[PDB]
Amino acid sequence: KEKLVAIVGPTAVGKTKTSVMLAKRLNGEVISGDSMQVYRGMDIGTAKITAEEMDGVPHHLIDIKDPSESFSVADFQDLATPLITEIHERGRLPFLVGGTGLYVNAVIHQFNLGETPSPYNLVMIGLTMERDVLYDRINRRVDQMVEEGLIDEAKKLYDRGIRDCQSVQAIGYKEMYDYLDGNVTLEEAIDTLKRNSRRYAKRQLTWFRNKANVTWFDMTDVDFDKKIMEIHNFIAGKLEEKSK
C-alpha cells in the first residue's frame, strides 16, 4: 500500500478508456470507485464496463453485490484498502478509477469511518472536457441506454420487487421508476435522466476542481494515441521523484 494512481472526473470523459490504456502501459490493475459498478445484473443503467473494453486488464469491485443490498463508503474502504496492498504483492500498480469525491477521499486519506497528506504515493489525475461536448456526450449516452433496453431492465427490476435501496435510487434508475410508478411520461423521464446526469457531471467536476493535488488533462476531441503518452510519462515521472 505505497504507490497508487487515481483517475477522477465526471462521466463520459474517458476515464475507463484512458484507464485501461495506462494499465497496459504501467503493469496495473483497476479498482473501480463507481459504487454502481458493484451491482451485478444491472449493466445497462450503470454503464457497466464490459470484458471487451476492459481488455485484458483485471478489474475489482464490479459485480460483487446484489441489486437489493447497499454499498456504503465504509464497505468500499474495507475492500479498497486490502486490494491496494494485494495488488502490489503481484507487482502491479493499483489504479483507483472513478467514484464520488467521498469514496476517493476515504481511501486516499484513510478516513476513520464509523486535508492531511495521503499515506500513499498518489498520483491524482483529472479528466476534463469542454462543457458542451461533455453534455452532448452525456445526452447521447442516455440515448444508447434507451435503445439498448434500459427501460426493460428497470421494469424487470421493478417487477422483481427491488426498491427502497440505493441501487434503485441511483441517479440513473430513479428516473425510470418515476416513470413506471406513473408520475411522468417516458420521454419526460428520459429527458430528466439526461438533465440529472448533466447536473451531476457538473457537480463532480467542480468538486474535484476544488481539491488540489489534482493534475488536469482535458481530452475533448483528442487523439488517445497522443494524450496517453503525455499522461503516461507524467505519471511515471511523478511516481519516481516523490520517492526520495
DSSP-derived 3-state class of residue 19: helix
Grid coordinates given for 39: 451491482
User: Residue 146, annotated ligand binder?
Assistant: no
Q: Using the CB atoms, write b or e for 32-69: b if 16+ within 10 Å.
A: bbbbbbbbebbbbbbbbbeeeebeebebbbbeeeebee
Q: Assign residue 145 a region: left if phi > 0, alpha if psi is -120 to 50, beta otherwise? A: alpha
Q: Which amino acid, one-letter code, is at 154?
A: A
141-148, Cβ contacts within 8 angstroms, sequence gap of 24 or more: 141/11, 141/12, 141/47, 141/197, 142/190, 142/193, 142/194, 142/197, 145/44, 145/45, 145/47, 146/190, 148/44
Asked if residues 63 and 36 have their Cβ atoms less than 8 Å apart, the reply is: no
User: Residue 206, annotated ligand binder?
Assistant: no
DSSP string, 199-233: HHHHHHHHHHHHSSS-EEEE-SS--HHHHHHHHHH
Structural domains in the chain? 1-130+213-244 (3.40.50.300), 131-212 (1.10.287.890)
Asked if residues 162 and 174 have their Cβ atoms less than 8 Å apart, the reply is: no
Could you identify the residue written with the cell 497528506? 117
Listed in sequence order, the residues at least 6 apart from 182 whose beta carbon sits closer than 8 Å to its beta carbon are none
Q: Using the CB atoms, write b or e for 188-210: b if 16+ within 10 Å.
A: ebbeebbeebbebbeebbebbee
User: Residue 11, annotated ligand binder?
Assistant: yes
DSSP-derived 3-state class of residue 95: strand
Cα–Cα distance measured from residue 127 to residue 220, given in angstroms and rounded to the nearest whole number: 9
User: Residue 98, annotated ligand binder?
Assistant: no
DSSP string, 36-88: GGGBTT--TTTTPPPTTTTTT--EESSS-B-TTS---HHHHHHHHHHHHHHHH
Q: Which of 141, 82, 142, 121 is nearest to 2 (CA)?
A: 121
Could you identify the residue written with the cell 476542481? 209
Q: Using the CB atoms, write b or e for 154-186: b if 16+ within 10 Å.
A: beebbeeebeeeebbebebbbbbbebbeeeeee
User: Residue 16, annotated ligand binder?
Assistant: yes
User: Residue 67, annotated ligand binder?
Assistant: no
Could you identify the residue written with the cell 446484489? 66
Listed in sequence order, the residues at least 6 apart from 65 whose beta carbon sits closer than 8 Å to its beta carbon are 38, 39, 40, 71
Give the sheet arrangement for strand 3-8, strand by strand: 59-60, 28-32, 93-97, 3-8, 121-128, 215-218
**Overall resolution, Å:** 2.4
Please tell me what DSSP assigns to residue 14.
S
List beta partners, residue 216.
126
